[PDB]
Structure formats: C-alpha cells, structure tokens
Amino acid sequence: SKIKMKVPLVEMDGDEMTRIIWRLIKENLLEPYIELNTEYYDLGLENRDKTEDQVTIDAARAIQKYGVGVKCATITPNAQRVEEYNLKKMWKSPNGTIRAILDGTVFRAPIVVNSIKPFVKGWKKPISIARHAYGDNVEYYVPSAGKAELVFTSENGEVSRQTIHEFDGPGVIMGMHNTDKSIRSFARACFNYALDMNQDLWFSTKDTISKTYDHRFKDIFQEIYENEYKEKFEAKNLQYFYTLIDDAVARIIRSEGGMVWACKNDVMSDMVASAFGSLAMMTSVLVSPDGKYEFEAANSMATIFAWTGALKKRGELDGIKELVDFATKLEQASVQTIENGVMTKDLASLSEVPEKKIVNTEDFLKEIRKTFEGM
Amino acid sequence: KIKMKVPLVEMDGDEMTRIIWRLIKENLLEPYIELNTEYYDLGLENRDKTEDQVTIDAARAIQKYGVGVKCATITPNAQRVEEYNLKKMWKSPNGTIRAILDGTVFRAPIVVNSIKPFVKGWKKPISIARHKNVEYYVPSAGKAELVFTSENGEVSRQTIHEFDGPGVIMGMHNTDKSIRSFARACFNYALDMNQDLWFSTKTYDHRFKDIFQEIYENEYKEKFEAKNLQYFYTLIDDAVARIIRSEGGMVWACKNYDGDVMSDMVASAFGSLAMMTSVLVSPDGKYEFEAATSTNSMATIFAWTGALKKRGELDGIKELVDFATKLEQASVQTIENGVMTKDLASLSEVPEKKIVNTEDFLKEIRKTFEGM
Numbered sequence: 117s118k119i120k121m122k123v124p125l126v127e128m129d130g131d132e133m134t135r136i137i138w139r140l141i142k143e144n145l146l147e148p149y150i151e152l153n154t155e156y157y158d159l160g161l162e163n164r165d166k167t168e169d170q171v172t173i174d175a176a177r178a179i180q181k182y183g184v185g186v187k188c189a190t191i192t193p194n195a196q197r198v199e200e201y202n203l204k205k206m207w208k209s210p211n212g213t214i215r216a217i218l219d220g221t222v223f224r225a226p227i228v229v230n231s232i233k234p235f236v237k238g239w240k241k242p243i244s245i246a247r248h249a250y251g252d253n254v255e256y257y258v259p260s261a262g263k264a265e266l267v268f269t270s271e272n273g274e275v276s277r278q279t280i281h282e283f284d285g286p287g288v289i290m291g292m293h294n295t296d297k298s299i300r301s302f303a304r305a306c307f308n309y310a311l312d313m314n315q316d317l318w319f320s321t322k323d324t325i326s327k328t329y330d331h332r333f334k335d336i337f338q339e340i341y342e343n344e345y346k347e348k349f350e351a352k353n354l355q356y357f358y359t360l361i362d363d364a365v366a367r368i369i370r371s372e373g374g375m376v377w378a379c380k381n382d383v384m385s386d387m388v389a390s391a392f393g394s395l396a397m398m399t400s401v402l403v404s405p406d407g408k409y410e411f412e413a414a415n416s417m418a419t420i421f422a423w424t425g426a427l428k429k430r431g432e433l434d435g436i437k438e439l440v441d442f443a444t445k446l447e448q449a450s451v452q453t454i455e456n457g458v459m460t461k462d463l464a465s466l467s468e469v470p471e472k473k474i475v476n477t478e479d480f481l482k483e484i485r486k487t488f489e490g491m
Numbered sequence: 492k493i494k495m496k497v498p499l500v501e502m503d504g505d506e507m508t509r510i511i512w513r514l515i516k517e518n519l520l521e522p523y524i525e526l527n528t529e530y531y532d533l534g535l536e537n538r539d540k541t542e543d544q545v546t547i548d549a550a551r552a553i554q555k556y557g558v559g560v561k562c563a564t565i566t567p568n569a570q571r572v573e574e575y576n577l578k579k580m581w582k583s584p585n586g587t588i589r590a591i592l593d594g595t596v597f598r599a600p601i602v603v604n605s606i607k608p609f610v611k612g613w614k615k616p617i618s619i620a621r622h623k624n625v626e627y628y629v630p631s632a633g634k635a636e637l638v639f640t641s642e643n644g645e646v647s648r649q650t651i652h653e654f655d656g657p658g659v660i661m662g663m664h665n666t667d668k669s670i671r672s673f674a675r676a677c678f679n680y681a682l683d684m685n686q687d688l689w690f691s692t693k694t695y696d697h698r699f700k701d702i703f704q705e706i707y708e709n710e711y712k713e714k715f716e717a718k719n720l721q722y723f724y725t726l727i728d729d730a731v732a733r734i735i736r737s738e739g740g741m742v743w744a745c746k747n748y749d750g751d752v753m754s755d756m757v758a759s760a761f762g763s764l765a766m767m768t769s770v771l772v773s774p775d776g777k778y779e780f781e782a783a784t785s786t787n788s789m790a791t792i793f794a795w796t797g798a799l800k801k802r803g804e805l806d807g808i809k810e811l812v813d814f815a816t817k818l819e820q821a822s823v824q825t826i827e828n829g830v831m832t833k834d835l836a837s838l839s840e841v842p843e844k845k846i847v848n849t850e851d852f853l854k855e856i857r858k859t860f861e862g863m
Contacts, residue, residue, distance in 0.1 A: 235611045235735050236760075254637060255694040256649045262641035266625050266651075266662030270633040277638070278625045280662045287666035288695045291637040291651035293629075295658035322751070328626040329659045361752065366759040369609050383727055383749050387756055390732040391610075 118151045119442055122434040125426055126178045126410075127154035128210075130188025131161055137416055137477060138188045141423060144481040145488070149442060150427070155182070159190055159210050165203045172210040176217035179408055183433055186426035187211075187412040188419070211402075214410060215249065220402035221305035222250045223376070224385070224414055226392035227399065227421055229451050231467040236391045241374025243392075245385040246309065248302040254291045264289045292329075294381070299333055302378070303340040304405035307356075310376040311348055312403070312429075318357040319378045320364040333380060334358060393466055399425060415462060416477050420450050420484075449488040458483045492525045493814060496806040499798055500552040500779075501528035502584075504562025505535055511788045511849060512562045515795060518853040519818060519860075524799070524811070529556065533584050535565045539577050546584040550591035557805060559779040560798035561588070562791070588779060594771040595622045595676035597742065598754045598783045600761035601768060601793055603823050605839035610760040615739030616768075617757050618686065621750035622673040626661045635660045670699055673744070674706040675774035678722075681742045682714060683772075683801075687721045690744040691730040699746065700724060758783075762838055768793045785833040786849045792822050792856075821860040830855045 129135060146152055157175035164171060179185040191197065193206040215222065225244040234240070258264065264280040280289055310317040319337050323330035341349075341356050349356060359367070365384065368377065379385070389395050398414035399421050409429050411422040424443040431439030453459070457469045460480050464472050475483065503509055520526060531549035538546060553559040565571060566583040589596070599616040602608075629635060635651040651660055681688035690703055707715075707722050715722060725733075727749070734743065745753060758764055767783030767790055780798040782790040796815040803811030826835060829842035836846050847855055 233611070236609055237611065238609070254649050254651055256637050256639060256647065257694045257698065258639055258641075260641055260643075262639055262643075264662070264664060265638045265640070266627065266660065267636045267638045267648075268627055268629060268633065268660065269636070270631060276627070278627065278662075280625055280637075281664040281666075283664075283666060285666055285668050287664060287669070288698050289637050289639065289662060289664045290695055291635070291649065292661045292663075293635060293652040293654075293658060295629075295652075295654060295656055297656055297658070299658075326624065326626060326661070328628055329624075329661045332628070332659045362755050365752065365755045366764075369756070369759045383731065383745075384752050384756075386728045386731045387735070387752075390735045395732075 118149060119436070119438045120151055121153040121430070121439065122436065123182050123430065124153045124155045125430050126175060126182055126185030127156050128175050128185060128187040129156070129158040129160050129163075131191040134189040134413070134419065135160060137419055140478060140481055141416065141419055144485050145420065145446060146423060146427075148485075149446075150439070154186075159187070161191055161193070161197065161201055161203065161207075164207060164210070165201065168204070169207055169210075169213070172213050173217065175210075176214045179214070179218060179410055180406075183408060184426055184430045185410045186422055187214075187410055189413050211412070215402060218402060218404045218408050218410065219301055219406070220404045220408070220410070221246055221248045221302055221309075223309055223401045223403060224250075224389065225399050225401075226389065227397050227417055227451075228392070229397075229454055229467070231455055231469045232393045232397070232463075233468060234392050236369060238371065239373040239391060241372055243368070243373045243388050244309070244313070244315075244376045245388050246306050246376055246378040247385070248298060248305075248381060256289050258283050258287050258289060260286060266291065294329075294332070296332070296336060299336040300340060301405045303337045304344070305403045306337075306376060306378045307340065307345040307349075308405070308407050309401070309403045310354060310356075311345065311352065312407075313376065314352060314354065316355045316357060316375045317378065318359065318364055318368065318375055320359045320361045321380055322361050324360065330380070394462075396462070397466070401425060416460070416480065417450060417463070421447060445491060446484075446488060449491055450484050452491075453480075453484045453487040456487070492523060493808070493810045494525050495527035495802065495811065496808060497556050497802065498527045498529045499802050500531070500549065500556055500559035502531045502533045502549050502559060502561040502564075504533055504564040506565070507784070507786065508563040508782070508791065509534060511786065511791060514850055514853055515788060515792055518850075518857050519792065520795060520799075522857075523814060528560075533561070533564050535567065535571070535575055535577075535581075538564075538581050538584065539575065542578065543581050543584075543587070546587050547591065549584075550588045553588070553592060553777050553779060554775075557777055558798050558802050559588075559777075560794055561585075561779055561781040563782050585781070589771060592771065592773045592775075592777055592779070593672045594773045594777070594779070595620050595673055595680070597680050597770050597772065598758070599768050599770075600758065600763075601766040601789060601823075602761065603766075603826050603839065605827050605841035606762050606766070606835075607840065608761055610735070612737075613739045613757075613760060616761075617734070617739045618680070618684070618742045619750050619754040619757055620673075620677050620680070620742060620744040621747050621754075622669065622676070624661050624663045626659060629654050629658050629660055631657060637662060665695070665698070667698070667702060670702045671706060672774045674703045675710070676772045677703075677742060677744045678706065678711040678715075679774070679776055680770070680772045681720060681722075682711070682718070684742070685718060685720065686740060686742045687723060688742045688744060689723050689725070689730055689734070691725050691727040692746065696746075763835075765790060765834060768797060770797060784849045785846065785852075787832045787834045788849065788853065789822060789826075789835075793819060818856075818860060821862075822856050825852070825856045825859040828859070
C-alpha cells in the first residue's frame with residue numbers, strides 16, 4: 117500500500133527544464149510509493165504573470181497555514197524572457213517575496229557523496245551555512261573634501277552624531293544597520309533549524325573589535341538561547357557555540373562538519389560551499405522564527421533532496437514514521453546509485469568511482485528507482 | 492663572513508620572542524654574516540620610556556634604508572598597563588609602523604611536506620593581503636543617516652534606516668588615496684615574488700575595481716607581462732572556487748573584513764598559525780618582515796631571511812641572497828629529518844622524532860646547514 121499523508125505539502129512549480137525534471141521526479145520516485153497530498157501553486161513565469169504575482173503571496177501564506185513547502189527553481193525575468201513570454205513586468209524573484217512573508221533565514225548545505233571528495237579532508241558531514249537574508253546597506257560617494265558623519269535623530273527630535281572621517285579627497289562611506297527584532301528573528305530560526313537537524317549551532321562575529329554592533333548579536337543569541345532553546349538543546353545533547361570568527365574557522369576546519377554555522381549579514385560561506393564540491397550539489401532551506409520551512413534546490417539530486425527534506429519534515433510533524441523513513445531511504449538510494457557508478461555527465465566529472473556508466477537525467481531517475489527497490 | 496652594504500632596520504620585541512630573536516642571531520646569522528643593522532628596541536619598557544617615540548623613529552628608519560625586520564611585541568591592554576606601570580595605552584607598533592609607511596600586509600604560510608595540509612592540494616604558499624568604525628546603539632524609534640558636509644557647505648544625507656525599535660548602526664569609510672596605496676603595494680609584492688595578483692569583491696566595490704584596473708594599465712601592465720604574470724580580477728564567489736581548486740602560489744587581495752577570514756582559512760588550511768610569515772610592503776617599495784621551553788621559532792627565522800634576501804637583492808649582494816635561501820631550506824630540511832619542537836611534532840607525521848627544546852632546534856638547524 118502506498119504511504120498515506122495527512123496535512124498537505126505546499127508544492128510550488130518552477131520554470132523551464134527544472135519543471136520537467138520536477139515532474140519526472142514525482143513520477144518515478146514519489147507517486148509510486150506515496151499517496152502524494154500537496155496543495156499546488158504554479159510559480160512558473162507564465163502563471164506569475166497572469167496572477168500579477170498574487171500566486172506567490174498565496175503560496176507563502178499557505179506555507180504559514182500548513183508548515184512546510186517545497187519549491188522548484190524559478191527564473192528571474194530578463195529583457196529577453198519578457199519578450200520570449202510577453203510579460204507585463206520584470207518581476208522580483210519569488211524567493212525574495214516568500215522569504216519576507218515568512219520572515220525566514222536561509223540555510224544552505226551540501227549533499228555529501230563519498231565518491232565526491234571534499235577539498236577539506238575531514239569534512240564528511242554537511243555544514244549548513246545560515247544567513248538571515250541572502251543576496252543584497254547604503255553607500256555615498258564623497259566627491260571632495262569634507263566631514264562624514266553617522267547620525268541618529270530620535271522620535272523627539274534629539275540628534276546625535278559621530279565623525280566617520282574627515283576627507284581630504286574623494287572616497288566612499290557606508291552605513292549598516294540591524295534591528296533587535298531582525299537579530300532575534302535570525303537567532304530563533306538558527307536555533308529551530310539546529311534542533312530540527314540535531315546538530316550544534318555555531319555563531320561567530322568579530323566582537324572584540326566591534327564593541328557594540330557585534331556585541332548586540334552576541335547578547336541576543338545568548339538571551340534567546342537561555343529563555344528559549346537551552347532546555348531543548350540539552351534534552352538532545354546539542355550545544356550552542358558562540359565564538360570569534362578566527363577561532364571558529366580553525367575549529368571547524370579541524371572537524372568532521374555536521375554543524376549549523378551562522379554569521380552576520382559572505383565569503384566564509386562560499387568557501388564552505390566550494391570546499392564540498394559544486395554549488396549545484398546543495399540544498400537550500402528557509403526556516404522561520406516560527407518553525408515554518410520551505411525546501412528548494414540551491415541537478416536532479418538537489419531537487420530530489422528538496423522533496424525528501426520536505427517529506428521528512430512533513431512526516432515528523434504529523435507523526436508518520438513510514439514517511440520519514442521513506443525520505444531517508446530515497447536519499448540513501450540516490451546516493452547509493454551514484455556510488456554504484458550510474459550517474460549523469462555532471463555527477464561523473466565530480467565523482468571518483470572507477471567504473472562509471474553515464475546516462476541521461478531520465479534514466480538516472482530510473483536507476484535510483486531500481487536501487488530503491490533493491491533496498 | 493658575508494659583508495653587508497646598507498643596514499637592515501632591526502626592531503627588537505618582547506619577552507620570549509626577544510630571547511629567541513637573540514638566539515636566532517647567535518646561532519644562525521652572526522657566525523656567517525657581519526650583521527649590519529640599525530637597532531631599535533620596541534620592547535615595551537623602552538616604548539614606554541621614549542613614550543613610543545622609538546617606534547616612530549623605527550618607521551622612519553625604514554623609509555630611509557628600505558627594509559626592516561621586526562620582533563613580535565606586546566600590545567598593551569588594561570592588564571598590561573598595570574603589570575608594566577605604563578604611562579599610557581601605547582598603540583600597537585605594528586599599527587604605527589603600518590600607518591607611517593602606509594603599507595599593506597601580506598601573510599603566507601611556511602610549507603613543509605611532512606606537515607599535512609587540511610586542504611587537498613595547496614602545495615604553494617598563498618599570500619593574503621590587507622591594507623576602525625563608528626557604531627551606535629539605537630535605543631528607541633527614530634532615523635539613522637549617513638551625512639556628509641562638504642567643505643563648500645553642502646550637506647547630503649542618505650537614510651540608513653527608519654527604526655521603530657532599538658538596534659544598531661555602523662558607518663565606515665575608504666578614501667581613493669587608500670585604495671591606491673593598496674593596489675600599488677599589491678602589485679609591487681606580486682612582482683617581487685613572481686606571483687599573479689587576484690582581487691575580488693555598487694559604489695563601494697566598483698570604486699575599488701576601477702582604481703585597481705587604472706593603476707594596472709598605467710603602472711604595472713608593462714612590468715607584469717615582462718615576467719608573464721596575470722592580474723586577475725573577479726567575483727569573490729568565483730575566486731574562492733578557483734583558488735580552492737588550484738595549487739596555491741598567488742597573491743590574493745581582499746577588502747579588509749574579507750582578508751580577515753581567508754587568512755584564517757588559508758592559515759589554518761595549511762596547518763598552524765605558527766608557520767606564518769608576514770611582510771609589510773609600501774607603495775614606495777619599502778619592506779618590513781615580521782613573524783605573522785620548546786618553542787617554534789620558524790616564522791621568526793623566515794622574517795630574518797626574508798629581510799636579508801631582500802636586502803641582498805637591493806644591494807646586489809648575491810652571497811647574502813643565496814645564504815638566506817640556504818638557511819630557509821636548512822630550517823625546513825631539519826624538520827623533515829624529524830628533529831623539531833614539541834609544538835611542531837603534533838603537526839608533522841613522518842617519522843621517529845627527536846624533539847628538542849627552543850635553543851636546541853636552532854643548534855640542530857645550524858648542524859643541518861653545516862652540511863651542504
């Protein structure tokens with residue numbers, strides 16, 4: 117009997133080839149085993165165009181209603197496509213909209229396969245790089261000599277200023293901010309995801325240098341930990357490591373990976389990504405302070421693992437043991453088929469297995485399905 | 492003994508490194524060279540006594556002669572002030588020297604084969620280059636702004652954020668003058684060392700990219716090609732991925748904040764914060780070399796050799812250059828033979844090992860040296 121679901125998964129459709137691949141994955145790997153229950157939203161460009169993007173907002177809201185969504189890769193509008201599709205507007209990427217409705221923090225993590233060798237030797241468990249909003253502060257270009265200042269005016273009109281620099285030539289000045297609210301929100305999602313994934317949270321700053329700004333991140337994380345997560349972390353023997361950025365990269369490079377690593381709103385994170393292998397071999401997960409999740413691909417492997425992360429999460433929530441086990445089994449089967457040497461052209465240029473059979477995406481999905489049946 | 496021509500500017504330092512500094516001289520340099528140095532005591536008591544004037548004078552000695560070698564020094568905190576009875580919180584000398592010379596610092600590991608890297612394929616030192624902020628705790632609602640008042644009176648404002656609650660703000664800067672010393676120092680070093688230069692990062696960053704380009708076409712394009720070196724600009728995400736996939740051997744330049752990490756990354760990637768050289772370079776071409784009981788003194792030998800080799804090339808004295816090279820090589824070979832300090836024996840495998848004490852290691856290298 118196929119596995120029975122309860123609460124539906126929010127399923128959001130994407131664009132172009134990933135949309136074919138998404139359907140191919142459902143058809144070969146999920147529907148045979150599970151009586152899929154999803155609430156469907158088409159976030160391909162055409163439907164976004166027709167609904168003037170309302171369908172994206174609807175999808176986010178439905179993630180709030182149910183808890184979990186899974187999302188196909190989508191396109192960001194460009195001179196051509198517009199023409200190509202005759203769209204009314206160059207639309208902002210939906211993930212930006214969905215993130216802000218969810219107030220979510222974003223976690224990216226590699227997909228480990230033994231035959232794809234990390235460049236850091238010991239790194240065999242995925243490290244999740246966490247950011248509160250991944251991909252965007254104010255600048256001003258000084259044309260000539262003068263006095264640059266960082267200035268704050270409170271409600272009541274009181275003004276305070278500090279000198280940034282007294283220029284004697286042209287240059288740039290930059291302002292950065294964070295509200296307590298965004299930091300608390302960042303902290304909660306990080307602690308959620310870490311609990312949810314059963315691994316330690318590491319947060320690092322450079323707070324001996326920045327005596328006020330980084331200090332605030334540090335104190336809010338510690339606050340949020342005590343008042344909100346300490347007891348849960350202990351129950352599962354998870355730890356929260358606060359530390360200096362220098363101390364953390366030395367310690368993490370010395371480890372086996374397998375932890376959640378958060379940093380201030382960028383380079384530490386591409387290093388992690390690249391250290392493990394292609395940036396395609398990667399899951400991307402949005403978590404909210406609230407415990408809402410959306411899984412997306414950061415390559416059929418990423419799309420498979422977006423679905424299995426989502427199924428596994430949806431099943432944990434609903435107490436469907438069978439569904440969580442399915443999701444683990446299908447992940448293991450995906451990896452195992454690569455390890456037996458059947459894979460696509462791109463997995464092959466990454467993998468070390470001595471005898472490889474290269475096949476197309478479709479045949480690949482079919483082989484994972486053969487491996488799954490052997491398990 | 493190799494005679495010297497122009498003096499090396501030599502800056503003595505603090506505590507244990509000061510002793511080792513002297514030990515390296517006595518066992519490794521003085522028996523082979525007639526040390527010509529102009530000597531500055533940047534110990535802490537002497538900085539306090541001269542009220543940090545000796546640090547300024549040391550900096551200027553480097554502008555005059557061109558090359559300095561410097562021992563690690565204490566930067567005093569509250570704790571030190573009481574401990575040493577300081578008159579003031581003297582600034583970091585590294586800090587002062589840097590400013591006077593307007594220099595960029597390049598950090599690079601020291602590689603030895605028996606010491607396994609954490610990163611698969613990094614066989615060649617990678618050199619990482621780098622050239623404070625105001626902050627405020629927003630305590631309740633209003634408006635945060637960058638403001639600029641031009642000396643003609645005009646006042647331009649940019650909103651940072653409208654707060655409805657508490658949070659934090661920060662402001663920072665960079666002058667064009669600054670980006671230009673940075674680019675010059677990076678191109679100089681890349682040349683001196685026969686390495687390619689990599690740089691990576693809308694107004695803040697394009698400003699940087701523009702200025703580097705300009706300085707390249709106008710002042711270096713020519714000298715680089717004369718030695719078949721590439722200047723490669725690109726996006727940080729691409730650089731890191733190409734860098735991680737290469738063998739090492741380049742100069743990697745980044746905005747502060749980002750060279751902060753990578754040198755952590757690279758440092759710890761190669762294996763040991765102790766095995767790190769540090770060389771300061773100015774746009775004018777002035778240089779300073781510094782270290783970035785059984786104590787590892789290897790970064791401090793390589794500071795002395797770096798400076799003596801550079802001094803030899805500027806003074807057209809080949810035996811001094813060849814000696815620097817020989818000693819570096821003999822320092823490395825000794826470790827490879829399995830005689831090493833406690834700290835380094837946790838690192839390198841290879842072997843059965845005779846671990847020795849600080850001064851013993853120095854005697855042992857000399858032995859490796861006497862011994863072509």
